[PDB]
Design a binder for this molecule. Structure first.
Ligand SMILES: *[C@@H]1O[C@H](CO)[C@@H](O[C@@H]2O[C@H](CO)[C@@H](O[C@@H]3O[C@H](CO[C@H]4O[C@H](CO)[C@@H](O)[C@H](O)[C@@H]4O)[C@@H](O)[C@H](O[C@H]4O[C@H](CO)[C@@H](O)[C@H](O)[C@@H]4O)[C@@H]3O)[C@H](O)[C@H]2NC(C)=O)[C@H](O)[C@H]1NC(C)=O
Ligand SMILES: *[C@@H]1O[C@H](CO)[C@@H](O[C@@H]2O[C@H](CO)[C@@H](O[C@@H]3O[C@H](CO[C@H]4O[C@H](CO)[C@@H](O)[C@H](O)[C@@H]4O)[C@@H](O)[C@H](O[C@H]4O[C@H](CO)[C@@H](O)[C@H](O)[C@@H]4O)[C@@H]3O)[C@H](O)[C@H]2NC(C)=O)[C@H](O)[C@H]1NC(C)=O
Ligand SMILES: *[C@@H]1O[C@H](CO)[C@@H](O[C@@H]2O[C@H](CO)[C@@H](O[C@@H]3O[C@H](CO[C@H]4O[C@H](CO)[C@@H](O)[C@H](O)[C@@H]4O)[C@@H](O)[C@H](O[C@H]4O[C@H](CO)[C@@H](O)[C@H](O)[C@@H]4O)[C@@H]3O)[C@H](O)[C@H]2NC(C)=O)[C@H](O)[C@H]1NC(C)=O
Ligand SMILES: *[C@@H]1O[C@H](CO)[C@@H](O[C@@H]2O[C@H](CO)[C@@H](O)[C@H](O)[C@H]2NC(C)=O)[C@H](O)[C@H]1NC(C)=O
Ligand SMILES: *[C@@H]1O[C@H](CO)[C@@H](O[C@@H]2O[C@H](CO)[C@@H](O)[C@H](O)[C@H]2NC(C)=O)[C@H](O)[C@H]1NC(C)=O
Ligand SMILES: *[C@@H]1O[C@H](CO)[C@@H](O[C@@H]2O[C@H](CO)[C@@H](O)[C@H](O)[C@H]2NC(C)=O)[C@H](O)[C@H]1NC(C)=O
Ligand SMILES: *[C@@H]1O[C@H](CO)[C@@H](O)[C@H](O)[C@H]1NC(C)=O
Ligand SMILES: *[C@@H]1O[C@H](CO)[C@@H](O)[C@H](O)[C@H]1NC(C)=O
Ligand SMILES: *[C@@H]1O[C@H](CO)[C@@H](O)[C@H](O)[C@H]1NC(C)=O
Lengths: 109, 123, 234, 108, 234, 108, 234, 109, 123, 109
């Protein structure tokens, strides 16, 4: 499976919403996870199951989409929200443990 | 609270070998038993390597197609888990992370909710 | 042929096709009746680990549905949500006109993953999944049902509490299946085949009162000791 | 008998029906369209048949609605069959005395 | 039980279940019949403002459909298309096999918006929507129907040109609903509950012949005076 | 009687039917697939039955098509029940004379 | 009405509605039987060029389906997949419950293009298309069927190797249609109205053995001479 | 509801066919309108209900789409058709009167 | 072995006329009968001209909407097919390709599998 | 029908996979063919029926899509894979010969 992100240095003024799209090559039945990685630090999980908010994550982030197209939207933008963003497809450990990451989309404040 | 510190890594000549150690503390190891390794080349995307069910009897070890034979994860009864690499080609220079798998209403899945700081490997 | 039950003198007999009896009387179609009876009335195991082993997946057989007009109050009812490891769904969606069983005391909601061979989940013993006045031969996704059978009768000439118990199963459909009772989104209890639903409710209450709930971001799975049966370990 | 309790009655029943009974008209390929399979009629003469029939229609609706609620049919097509079976069962549904008042058999 | 009408000596009577009437004869199933009769034969209001107030919205009741074999020519028929304020659709789509009433004289096509509570549109008096040989208990979107009731009978042993009138409704389903008769894409007439369809057609013709149509990009709404009844005001 | 007016008649009928009548074969889980629920036979011996049957099937189609056109069913399954009900009603429908030609109650 | 055949002393006679026959006896519903007989038993042309001329297209007539309980082994069965020139599909998809004819010796899989007027494909002679225990009046896409008729009877009181032949047609449904028997993805044979399936298989074998298959990326279409009937021309 | 337009200074030679896509954040049941705003002048309605052409507007413009995706197509672009374009979602005034405009797309001859 | 070389074309003054010939060899002409012409402006996209069923009796001559009454093709019994154009304009200056239409399981379609070298027409 | 391609001189390092998207203004029932054209040479057929692989073509190229959206994926991009790519909608020659070509997408190694 190949995943195509927005793939652009998105720039947005402070306070505006920023949207990132993670297209897939087939149906994945809403098995996407959204991660944020600041430079140097290890990535932090933001979204799993394409809709559920991870624990300790501000409600500003939102996820949606289904089938082959999924979106992550940041409604309110701050200075801290400047890092790389990834989308991965995951399997359940009962069967295979395949996990395919996206490309990576940086955000400029 | 919960830490996934890793040990090892550094400068090693090509066609060599090195062992990484992942130490876990601060959470129920028997309950959350899946541990995986992720590699990130400098300035590139992430890449799954292998997973292991460390913390309970049985389980399964899942490997990646690209990393077969060259890599080997070890089932240690202790929470620490070791990954041994052989025949280190020049393309292996990257940052390695030890991660813990997450769970959903339908059971444990491959997405990782806890990460380690990451160790450097240069060849 | 399908046997027909005749009730006379408060006694039940199977109608004989070749021997024509004149004593029995039929006046209108109101006398004919179809009644569905639950399997738990025969004294069979009802807990999830033993109940889920009677259902098996298959392919190449279309499903069939037949209605019935009267049923029996069911103490145990089931609700399944199974997905393949890749993320696809196994059980088909409930067609139009199909609803859950109306009278259920405890509803065992099981969600998990499995190999999901075949196409439809049939009963290994040949019984029916009753549903709401429409006994089928397959399991539908998200719809409450109850194992049972159907009988046809000629009648003589003459509050409700629902409790949902949530499980989680891994390896569903195989012989090596692991079940976990859920008390919280982060805390689970290992499930054995000797716990009545009231025991599970008491375990939930003890977990909540004694402060054994998970406080970290990970999962916490408790194991109850077999001897004392009241001091949960791990 | 039936007495009409409606506020007003229309004594004529200008009706349409579907039953007919030539050449190649029975073949669906050469048959009429979906709108030309109906007929017409007008029962202008009646001995109070129409005015009582409307009241019968009004009277039957409660039982019809209750029966529809009871069943789980998405579409019901078998009421008339049940009526015929009930008629036959009531006429002959068991032991039948020749001279009994509950039997239609007459001696001669 | 469902009453059954018997025609004897050109007289209608109700069949008696307990008393076996010997003279009644049924030779074949051809004699059995079901007939649908419109409500307008009982002398009830048929204009849209009075007709639309006999239907309500509800949720929690599945719809049912029963067939009938013969019907009565209908002078008034209705065709509804209602949207929620956000833009969604209220009435469910017509299932396969359902078609409009075959014989209508005037079809009142009403399109508008309303709060649209519930899930289905039922008849407040308990009648049926006849459709084509399939009387239902709910209204389908964009399908011609006519209110009526079904009767069952034992038969004794023995051009069509339509007209469509176009309305527009605001606040459909509520007690304060406003109706407008549409003569053009831009010109409308305020509607009262005393205008026969022929009067509406005459108003249309008079407006066109008198050159009262809107010439701007805005809307024009006329209002016929009550006394003179021929001098449309504004 | 029935006379075959078809251009040709096949004297042999190689048929298949689904009715059968063992262990766990009745259970759908262990039962045969959807392709193995049929049987086989051959009515090679005949006394004009097959040639009459083909002509009867040819004759029936007009009435069958008209009946299908009249109804509103998407799928019809109740023709045989209607035939049985009509047969019973014709045999017994009301007043029955014991010695009349309309009744089959033979005296002895 | 629908005729009903009765079998007495190995003789078939049509039951008479008005005349009451005393010798006729019906003990159970098992005696009633519906049987579907193919048209090929009446001595009709079975090859594709002649068979495809008995089907037409129409619009405005809904399709109807009936059942039958017994059938006959069919020597020739068909399977159609037709597309409009723009790329759309002509024949509707198979509804749930429709399956191919269970006993066919040769299956003439035909795929091609045509004007595809109307909406549904009907039989010009008024016969039925027999699917698995279901006689329909229209052709469904990619489903094996057999031309046949249905008869009703009162019963007296008391391996499988299929072969697929693949065709291709242009201008299906018109009077000027061209058929090409396909022996390979690149090689075709001009088809006439006098070739039995055995002859087609023999031609296929001869083509494969003699090495007359196309070797380039283009198409090669052979044409058998009428006289010699064994030396293919071009 | 968030309306995302093409968001690009689209350049097209005179005589071409330009297309502007206005994606939404959810299903809106085809309740869009298109406005052409020249610099300084007030906007002007072009297409309402996502398909119907406003009065006094050339048939050169054509709107299409459904669900969450809608497009406006201008054929044989002239020098006059050089203005900002907006997509706008509306409600029916029987209930709420909420409405949201798009970001705005500029077209260069 | 299998080619569709073209002849003619070059420099012509405006409001002139020209005739182009397409020659084929190495494949069954009776079976593969459809021949089409395609136009490509310098540095632009491709554009269809016309098609003909050359190789058997009957057939149909399909013309493009923009080219009606012009760019007339000729049905020649021989595999060579001619296309003549009149009222030439500077816009017509382009490369002309001769192509053979392909086939599918459902018949032959307009996608071309075999092309020609192409000639240059200058106005 | 208007065929809208990627319309961008996409550049990809050798070894990666490139993707070209060809949109349509209406449903076309998967009747697209993919062509490549090196500078000077006549175009060559790659994929017909939007999924079938034409003879004499390496399995690196793949085609997919349905309805109005169709994609061509070039796997293991090579130096020779440097040409202009086109998507064409065709018709069946039984009663029509209309065909519309795409805009053309350039690929840079
Ligand atoms: C109507 O009521 C009758 C009661 O007579 C039911 O009959 C039962 O039928 C089921 C199967 O249809 C029988 O279950 C079988 O059990 C075998 C082992 O016996 C167990 O139960 C006995 C009970 O005394 C114990 O003594 C014994 O120790 C066992 O615990 C199994 O071998 C059978 O198959 C199993 O193994 C095979 C091979 O590995 C697997 O493929 C199977 O999946 C399964 O695991 C089977 O399970 C049951 O014993 C019967 N009851 C009695 C009393 O004999 C009818 O089923 C019921 N009808 C309906 C419609 O409900
Ligand atoms: C079979 O035939 C009988 C009698 O012919 C019909 O009975 C009618 O029933 C409806 C309601 O089901 C009655 O309509 C009601 O009228 C009330 C006002 O009464 C007016 O009419 C009577 C007629 O006698 C006058 O005396 C009186 O002065 C009034 O002029 C309304 O207030 C009612 O509306 C209220 O109830 C309904 C339903 O509960 C609510 O939905 C409303 O919102 C409101 O709260 C109602 O409209 C009618 O009057 C009865 N007719 C007669 C002649 O008595 C049966 O309906 C009919 N069966 C079928 C199936 O059609
Ligand atoms: C029950 O059995 C009877 C008798 O076998 C069948 O009757 C057949 O009915 C079909 C049409 O329903 C007849 O087919 C017609 O053929 C005409 C020409 O006759 C041909 O066949 C005779 C047979 O002797 C030859 O002599 C003659 O030379 C012809 O070859 C056509 O004119 C008819 O219509 C055609 O032309 C019109 C106008 O051009 C077109 O519009 C039509 O589409 C069509 O092309 C028609 O085709 C057939 O001849 C009848 N059989 C006999 C023996 O006469 C019943 O069909 C059968 N029941 C069922 C259900 O199959
Ligand atoms: C497990 O026990 C907890 C604690 O008693 C239940 O949560 C309470 O449920 C009651 C309903 O019986 C509510 O009135 C309380 O407000 C709840 N309190 C809290 C803190 O949640 C919980 O519902 C039980 N779960 C099950 C499955 O029985
Ligand atoms: C209102 O009346 C006008 C005038 O008769 C109708 O407009 C004409 O309708 C006829 C058919 O009814 C058409 O043949 C004409 O082309 C129409 N236009 C004219 C005569 O200019 C109009 O349709 C009527 N409206 C309604 C709702 O009945
Ligand atoms: C035509 O005949 C050829 C050769 O007899 C068939 O090709 C063989 O088919 C069999 C089974 O059908 C396969 O087992 C072989 O592998 C095939 N290839 C050989 C023998 O080289 C072909 O299938 C036939 N086609 C039709 C339509 O009958
Ligand atoms: C389950 O079945 C498999 C099938 O081979 C077997 O290997 C395994 O041991 C079984 N497990 C148990 C617990 O019986
Ligand atoms: C409609 O009902 C509402 C309910 O609150 C009421 O306030 C209003 O006055 C009613 N309108 C009329 C015209 O009766
Ligand atoms: C087919 O029908 C058309 C109808 O006009 C006719 O022109 C043509 O000649 C017919 N074809 C044949 C082969 O008869």
């Amino acid at each position: 499976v190949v995943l195509t992100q927005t793939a652009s240095p998105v720039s947005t003024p402070v306070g505006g919403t920023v949207t990132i799209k993670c297209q897939a090559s087939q149906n994945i039945y809403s098995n996407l996870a959204w991660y944020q990685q600041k430079p140097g630090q290890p990535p932090k999980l933001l979204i799993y199951s394409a809709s559920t908010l991870a624990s300790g994550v501000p409600s500003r982030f939102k996820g949606s989409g289904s089938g082959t197209e999924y979106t992550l939207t940041i409604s309110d933008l701050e200075c801290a929200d400047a890092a790389t963003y990834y989308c991965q497809r995951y399997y359940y450990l009962s069967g295979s443990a395949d996990n395919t990451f996206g490309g990576g989309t940086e955000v400029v404040v | 609270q919960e830490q996934l510190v890793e040990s090892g890594g550094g400068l090693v000549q090509p066609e060599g070998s090195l062992t990484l150690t992942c130490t876990a503390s601060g959470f129920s190891f028997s309950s959350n038993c899946w541990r995986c390794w992720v590699r990130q080349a400098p300035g590139k995307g992430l890449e799954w390597i292998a997973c292991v069910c460390a913390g309970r009897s049985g389980g399964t070890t899942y490997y990646a197609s690209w990393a077969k034979g060259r890599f080997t994860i070890s089932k240690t009864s202790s929470p620490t888990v070791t990954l041994q690499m052989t025949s280190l080609t020049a393309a292996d220079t990257a940052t390695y992370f030890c991660a813990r798998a997450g769970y959903d209403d339908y059971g444990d899945a491959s997405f990782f909710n806890l990460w380690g700081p990451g160790t450097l490997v240069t060849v | 042929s399908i046997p027909l039950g005749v009730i006379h003198n408060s006694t039940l007999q199977v109608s004989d096709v070749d021997k024509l009896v004149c004593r029995d009387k039929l006046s209108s179609t109101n006398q004919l009746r179809s009644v569905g009876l639950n399997l738990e009335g025969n004294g069979v195991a009802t807990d999830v680990p033993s109940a889920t082993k009677r259902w098996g997946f298959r392919s190449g057989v279309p499903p069939k549905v037949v209605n019935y007009e009267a049923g029996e109050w069911a103490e145990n009812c089931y609700n399944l949500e199974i997905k393949k490891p890749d993320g696809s769904e196994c059980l088909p969606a409930a067609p139009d006109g199909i609803r859950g069983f109306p009278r259920c005391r405890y509803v065992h909601k099981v969600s998990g993953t499995g190999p999901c061979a075949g196409d439809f989940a049939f009963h290994k013993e040949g019984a029916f999944f009753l549903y709401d006045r429409l006994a089928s031969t397959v399991i539908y996704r998200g719809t409450t049902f109850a194992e049972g059978v159907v009988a046809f009768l000629i009648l003589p000439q003459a509050g409700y509490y629902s409790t949902t118990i949530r499980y989680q199963a891994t390896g569903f459909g195989t012989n090596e299946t692991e079940y976990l009772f859920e008390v919280d989104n982060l805390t689970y209890v290992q499930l054995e085949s000797r716990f009545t639903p009231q025991f599970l409710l008491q375990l939930n209450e003890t977990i909540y009162t004694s402060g054994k709930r998970s406080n970290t971001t990970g999962k916490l799975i408790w194991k109850v000791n077999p001897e004392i049966d009241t001091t949960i370990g791990e | 008998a039936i007495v009409n309790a409606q506020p007003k009655c229309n004594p004529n029943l200008h009706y349409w029906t579907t039953q007919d009974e030539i050449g190649l008209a029975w073949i669906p390929y050469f048959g009429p369209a979906a709108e030309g399979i109906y007929t017409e009629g007008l029962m202008h003469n009646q001995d109070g048949l129409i005015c009582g029939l409307r009241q019968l229609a009004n009277e039957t609706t409660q039982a019809l609605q209750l029966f529809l609620r009871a069943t789980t049919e998405l579409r019901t097509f078998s009421i008339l069959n049940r009526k015929a079976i009930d008629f036959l069962l009531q006429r002959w549904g068991g032991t039948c005395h020749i001279l009994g008042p509950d039997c239609c058999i007459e001696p001669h």
